[PDB]
């Protein structure tokens, strides 16, 4: 009832460290982004026990609800780190791009880039055959704030890119679609 | 007063050389490039410019066919090919003359006169220039390996009368192995190839590889430039250059510089082009071989002589006589170039690298550099062309001048997208043997016995390194911190006096402790004080930092939320990993899983049919290199390697369907 209440009132980030079972595994579906640790963290309603017992099934802990399961083929988790230290220094990161509540303004931050440079860089990037693909992801990195973007669900719907990066100090989020 | 339309016949910076010449003479230019060279600069610098064919240069640049209806449709009156391409193509000459097209280089009579070593040799006797003689018969006998030597010389060579590749060759001084190797020679030889017939000839020592270059008249006047030292060198193509050599006094240059003029007044060399003489420990100077062509090593010698090649021979085609004399070419300074490539140099000295540029900053700011370059950003480097990227060029009034200025460029220069061999470049120059001179033409496989490894720092540089890092990571977790203030929610700046860092570098981990005191980051490397002062621009690409009076410049070239960052310092990436105390205390506790790199597995991306593989089995790989495209949803999906080698197996052929996950090619 909260996580449904805050929904659209506060960001609400839920970052999986662990295994999660029964009931439990339904709060990182209410919340806006889940997070998981890759081999150390699981989503499950039941465990491979149950799927055994009920079904003539075989699949182990991984396979069932591993992060490596839901980060590039469920479409249930936003994205997984290598371990707990890295994950962490990622959440800082991506903390602060976002405003504390839906009553503010994208949050503005302090920038170096100047904002009014141009990028002759992307001048060919698009090729004049119809049948040759190229990388987005080489445009949104060239006008982006000092080329930082941070990109979700990197392995799952590849053919569509969504993130987060900033504008002359801005918060933006960006999509696009990846011809590749 | 001279020619309204020329066309060239090259791509690339040479290309923008003429073209900017052709500007500065009133001169409209015509350019040709194959499709993927359409955006390429010297197409847009250009006034016209023709599209002759596809990407590979046989069906574009070499075509002479195409590039002669090219020629025609603008009313080209002049061709300048540069180098390269058509620069010794005689039928192309032959048929472009027939069309009464003025052709800018030798004429047909230069390139075959020296066609083959016969002629060259020949020349070298007539123009009495040196070529020492060998011994114009067998040497069968014990005694003749020795009496013959004694007539003519001292280092004396055996080596077969026909063959190569050690087939019985050994060096000699002394009379004691020179009989014992002939006869050793003698008596095993046959056991090889069936012949045991020996010759000697006469050899040098520790050579440098020196080149004079000549401007010959078409009526008849040649005058010779001063020399350059060509000595820097991998797989039999020059990457430094310096002009004013070191090797040479006034008295050598000019008993030299007659030489080339009596090699090119004798065939009536009326261009421009190269002699080449090998110059042993002792100063004797010995004839190698005359090139027809303007040199990749022409604009070095510019900055001394203050000349303007092209500018030169766009008049000598025209018919005018040479605007100098002799007395008039003398050395104003010293200048030293180096080629930048595309290229991995720690994979046996260069390995090609493909891809797009993505930045890229000349060093134009800085005193006494002159780039010559003919790329501009969103430029892409491809296998069907040798991957220059640039010409760096520095010139000062001493030899310590040019150097530094050429060490300051090379830090300045951005280049990001592809590999690039600038590490190879800022080391080298700053060699003890490149600075005092000690160069021979196998400087480098003598220095890097076991490949290239990258600058390695000494104490004093690894502590500047840690600094420079550490006070950057800080620089950037302050910089996190200042928001624009949100009158509903207060924010609140944590009081952070001391920065406590972890600093692991390759295999040693260092205790670094910084504190911001403004624009100054005082910073303790394992009990050494640092104090590191900038402005902390963290958006530009070049950081100027000055560590504790010490001016140094860096590029940061990827951060990550982990800690790690890739810093260039000195030409070299290092790879630095930044925790704070805490988090690394507490990563000790995390599990070392290694997963296996596999890269050589290239399989399917994308369903769909097989169009093309640019590979069979035992081809050469590249990094980044298109080895499958596959078709399909009206969209040609190219698959690349992750991999430098070659191919071991190609496991699906072009007319194939494949789906996703499926193995194409395998590497080894
Ligand atoms: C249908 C629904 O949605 S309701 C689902 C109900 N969920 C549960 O009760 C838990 C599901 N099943 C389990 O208990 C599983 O063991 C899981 C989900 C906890 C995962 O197991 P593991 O990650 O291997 O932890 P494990 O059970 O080995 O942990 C052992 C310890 O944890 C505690 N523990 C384990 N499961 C439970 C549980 N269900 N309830 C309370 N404590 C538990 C025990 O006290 C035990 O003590 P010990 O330290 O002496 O061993």
Same mark, same amino acid.
């Given at each position: 009832?909260?996580?449904?209440?805050?929904?659209?009132?506060?960001?609400?980030?839920?970052?999986?460290?662990?295994?999660?079972?029964?009931?439990?595994?339904?709060?990182?579906?209410?919340?806006?982004?889940?997070?998981?640790?890759?081999?150390?963290?699981?989503?499950?309603?039941?465990?491979?026990?149950?799927?055994?017992?009920?079904?003539?099934?075989?699949?182990?802990?991984?396979?069932?609800?591993?992060?490596?399961?839901?980060? =590039? !083929? +469920?479409?249930?988790?936003?994205?997984?780190?290598?371990?707990?230290?890295?994950?962490?220094?990622?959440?800082?990161? #991506?903390?602060?791009?976002?405003?504390?509540?839906?009553?503010?303004?994208?949050?503005?931050?302090?920038? @170096?880039?100047? +904002?009014?440079?141009?990028?002759?860089?992307?001048?060919?990037?698009?090729?004049?055959?119809? =049948?040759?693909?190229?990388?987005?992801?080489?445009?949104?990195?060239?006008?982006?704030?000092?080329?930082?973007?941070?990109?979700?669900?990197?392995?799952?719907?590849?053919?569509?890119?969504?993130?987060?990066?900033?504008?002359?100090?801005?918060?933006?989020?960006?999509?696009?679609?990846?011809?590749? | 007063?001279?020619?309204?339309?020329?066309?060239?016949?090259?791509?690339?910076?040479?290309?923008?050389?003429?073209?900017?010449? /052709?500007?500065?003479?009133?001169?409209?230019?015509?350019?040709?490039? +194959?499709?993927?060279?359409?955006?390429?600069?010297?197409?847009?610098?250009?006034?016209?410019?023709?599209?002759?064919?596809?990407?590979?240069?046989?069906?574009?640049?070499?075509?002479?066919?195409?590039?002669?209806?090219?020629?025609?449709?603008?009313?080209? &009156?002049?061709? @300048?090919?540069?180098?390269?391409?058509?620069?010794?193509?005689?039928?192309?000459?032959?048929?472009?003359?027939?069309?009464?097209?003025?052709?800018?280089?030798?004429?047909?009579?230069?390139?075959?006169?020296?066609?083959?070593?016969?002629?060259?040799?020949?020349?070298?006797?007539?123009?009495?220039?040196?070529?020492? *003689?060998?011994?114009?018969?067998?040497?069968?006998?014990?005694?003749?390996?020795?009496?013959?030597?004694?007539?003519?010389?001292? *280092?004396? !060579?055996?080596?077969?009368?026909?063959?190569?590749?050690?087939?019985?060759?050994?060096?000699?001084?002394?009379?004691?192995?020179?009989?014992?190797?002939?006869?050793?020679?003698?008596?095993?030889?046959?056991?090889? #190839?069936?012949?045991?017939?020996?010759?000697?000839?006469?050899?040098?020592?520790?050579?440098? @590889?020196?080149?004079?270059?000549?401007?010959?008249?078409?009526?008849?006047?040649?005058?010779?430039?001063?020399?350059?030292?060509?000595?820097?060198?991998?797989?039999?193509?020059?990457?430094?250059?310096?002009?004013?050599?070191?090797?040479?006094?006034?008295?050598?240059?000019?008993?030299?510089?007659? &030489?080339?003029?009596?090699?090119?007044?004798?065939?009536?060399?009326?261009?421009?082009?190269?002699?080449? #003489?090998?110059?042993?420990?002792?100063?004797?100077?010995?004839?190698?071989?005359?090139?027809?062509?303007?040199?990749?090593?022409?604009?070095?010698?510019?900055?001394?002589?203050?000349?303007?090649?092209?500018?030169?021979? $766009?008049?000598?085609?025209?018919?005018?006589?040479?605007?100098?004399?002799?007395?008039?070419?003398?050395?104003?300074?010293?200048?030293?170039?180096?080629?930048?490539?595309?290229?991995?140099?720690?994979?046996?000295?260069?390995?090609?690298?493909?891809?797009?540029?993505?930045?890229? &900053?000349?060093?134009?700011?800085? *005193?006494?550099?002159?780039?010559?370059?003919?790329?501009?950003?969103?430029?892409? $480097?491809?296998?069907?062309?040798? *991957?220059?990227?640039?010409?760096?060029?520095?010139?000062?009034?001493?030899?310590?001048?040019?150097?530094?200025?050429?060490?300051?460029?090379?830090?300045?220069?951005?280049?990001?997208?592809?590999?690039?061999?600038?590490?190879?470049?800022?080391?080298?120059?700053?060699?003890?043997?490149?600075?005092?001179?000690?160069?021979?033409?196998?400087?480098?496989?003598?220095?890097?016995?076991?490949?290239?490894?990258?600058?390695?720092?000494?104490?004093?540089?690894?502590?500047?390194?840690?600094?420079?890092?550490?006070?950057?990571?800080?620089?950037?977790?302050?910089?996190?911190?200042?928001?624009?203030?949100?009158?509903?929610?207060?924010?609140?700046?944590?009081?952070?006096?001391?920065?406590?860092?972890?600093?692991?570098?390759?295999?040693?981990?260092?205790?670094?402790?910084?504190?911001?005191?403004?624009?100054?980051?005082?910073?303790?490397?394992?009990?050494?004080?640092?104090?590191?002062?900038? =402005?902390?621009?963290?958006?530009?690409?070049?950081?100027?930092?000055?560590?504790?009076?010490?001016?140094?410049?860096?590029? /940061?070239?990827?951060?990550?939320?982990?800690?790690?960052?890739?810093?260039?310092?000195?030409?070299?990436?290092?790879?630095?990993?930044?925790?704070?105390?805490?988090?690394?205390?507490?990563?000790?506790?995390?599990?070392?899983?290694?997963?296996?790199?596999?890269?050589?597995?290239?399989?399917?991306?994308?369903?769909?049919?097989?169009?093309?593989?640019?590979?069979?089995?035992?081809?050469?790989?590249?990094?980044?290199?298109?080895? /499958?495209? $596959?078709?399909? !949803?009206?969209?040609?999906?190219?698959?690349?390697?992750?991999?430098?080698?070659?191919?071991?197996?190609?496991?699906?052929?072009?007319?194939? =369907?494949?789906?996703?996950?499926?193995?194409?090619?395998?590497?080894?």
């Amino acid at each position: 009832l909260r996580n449904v209440t805050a929904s659209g009132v506060i960001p609400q980030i839920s970052l999986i460290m662990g295994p999660c079972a029964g009931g439990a595994v339904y709060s990182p579906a209410l919340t806006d982004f889940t997070f998981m640790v890759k081999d150390t963290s699981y989503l499950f309603i039941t465990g491979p026990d149950v799927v055994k017992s009920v079904t003539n099934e075989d699949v182990t802990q991984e396979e069932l609800g591993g992060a490596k399961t839901h980060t =590039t !083929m +469920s479409g249930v988790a936003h994205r997984a780190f290598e371990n707990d230290v890295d994950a962490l220094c990622n959440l800082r990161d #991506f903390f602060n791009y976002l405003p504390l509540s839906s009553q503010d303004p994208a949050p503005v931050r302090e920038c @170096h880039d100047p +904002s009014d440079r141009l990028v002759p860089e992307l001048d060919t990037i698009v090729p004049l055959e119809s =049948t040759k693909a190229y990388n987005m992801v080489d445009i949104i990195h060239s006008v982006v704030d000092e080329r930082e973007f941070f990109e979700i669900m990197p392995n799952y719907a590849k053919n569509i890119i969504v993130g987060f990066a900033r504008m002359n100090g801005r918060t933006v989020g960006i999509v696009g679609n990846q011809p590749k | 007063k001279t020619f309204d339309k020329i066309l060239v016949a090259n791509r690339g910076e040479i290309a923008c050389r003429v073209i900017r010449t /052709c500007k500065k003479m009133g001169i409209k230019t015509v350019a040709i490039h +194959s499709d993927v060279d359409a955006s390429s600069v010297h197409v847009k610098m250009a006034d016209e410019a023709v599209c002759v064919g596809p990407a590979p240069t046989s069906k574009s640049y070499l075509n002479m066919d195409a590039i002669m209806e090219a020629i025609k449709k603008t009313r080209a &009156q002049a061709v @300048h090919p540069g180098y390269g391409f058509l620069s010794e193509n005689k039928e192309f000459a032959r048929c472009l003359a027939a069309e009464d097209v003025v052709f800018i280089g030798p004429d047909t009579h230069a390139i075959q006169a020296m066609g083959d070593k016969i002629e060259s040799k020949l020349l070298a006797k007539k123009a009495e220039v040196n070529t020492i *003689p060998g011994f114009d018969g067998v040497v069968k006998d014990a005694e003749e390996a020795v009496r013959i030597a004694r007539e003519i010389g001292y *280092p004396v !060579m055996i080596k077969a009368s026909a063959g190569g590749g050690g087939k019985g060759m050994r060096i000699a001084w002394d009379d004691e192995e020179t009989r014992d190797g002939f006869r050793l020679s003698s008596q095993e030889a046959a056991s090889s #190839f069936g012949d045991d017939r020996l010759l000697i000839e006469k050899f040098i020592d520790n050579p440098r @590889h020196i080149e004079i270059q000549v401007l010959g008249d078409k009526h008849g006047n040649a005058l010779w430039l001063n020399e350059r030292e060509c000595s820097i060198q991998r797989r039999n193509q020059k990457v430094v250059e310096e002009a004013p050599s070191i090797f040479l006094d006034a008295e050598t240059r000019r008993a030299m510089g007659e &030489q080339a003029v009596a090699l090119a007044r004798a065939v009536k060399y009326s261009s421009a082009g190269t002699v080449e #003489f090998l110059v042993d420990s002792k100063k004797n100077f010995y004839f190698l071989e005359m090139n027809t062509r303007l040199q990749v090593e022409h604009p070095v010698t510019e900055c001394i002589t203050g000349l303007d090649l092209v500018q030169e021979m $766009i008049r000598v085609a025209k018919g005018y006589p040479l605007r100098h004399k002799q007395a008039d070419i003398r050395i104003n300074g010293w200048a030293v170039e180096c080629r930048v490539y595309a290229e991995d140099p720690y994979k046996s000295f260069g390995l090609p690298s493909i891809g797009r540029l993505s930045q890229y &900053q000349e060093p134009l700011h800085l *005193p006494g550099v002159r780039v010559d370059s003919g790329i501009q950003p969103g430029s892409d $480097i491809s296998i069907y062309y040798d *991957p220059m990227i640039s010409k760096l060029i520095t010139y000062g009034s001493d030899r310590t001048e040019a150097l530094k200025r050429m060490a300051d460029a090379l830090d300045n220069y951005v280049i990001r997208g592809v590999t690039h061999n600038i590490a190879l470049l800022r080391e080298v120059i700053i060699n003890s043997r490149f600075v005092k001179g000690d160069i021979s033409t196998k400087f480098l496989s003598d220095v890097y016995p076991d490949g290239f490894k990258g600058h390695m720092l000494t104490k004093s540089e690894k502590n500047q390194l840690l600094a420079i890092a550490s006070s950057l990571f800080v620089a950037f977790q302050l910089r996190a911190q200042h928001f624009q203030e949100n009158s509903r929610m207060p924010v609140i700046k944590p009081d952070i006096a001391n920065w406590e860092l972890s600093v692991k570098l390759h295999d040693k981990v260092h205790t670094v402790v910084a504190s911001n005191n403004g624009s100054v980051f005082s910073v303790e490397v394992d009990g050494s004080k640092l104090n590191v002062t900038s =402005t902390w621009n963290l958006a530009s690409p070049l950081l100027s930092v000055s560590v504790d009076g010490t001016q140094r410049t860096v590029q /940061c070239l990827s951060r990550e939320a982990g800690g790690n960052m890739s810093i260039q310092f000195l030409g070299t990436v290092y790879k630095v990993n930044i925790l704070t105390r805490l988090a690394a205390e507490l990563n000790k506790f995390m599990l070392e899983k290694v997963t296996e790199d596999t890269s050589s597995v290239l399989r399917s991306p994308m369903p769909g049919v097989v169009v093309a593989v640019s590979v069979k089995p035992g081809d050469a790989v590249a990094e980044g290199q298109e080895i /499958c495209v $596959i078709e399909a !949803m009206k969209m040609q999906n190219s698959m690349t390697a992750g991999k430098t080698g070659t191919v071991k197996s190609v496991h699906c052929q072009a007319g194939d =369907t494949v789906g996703e996950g499926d193995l194409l090619v395998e590497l080894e």
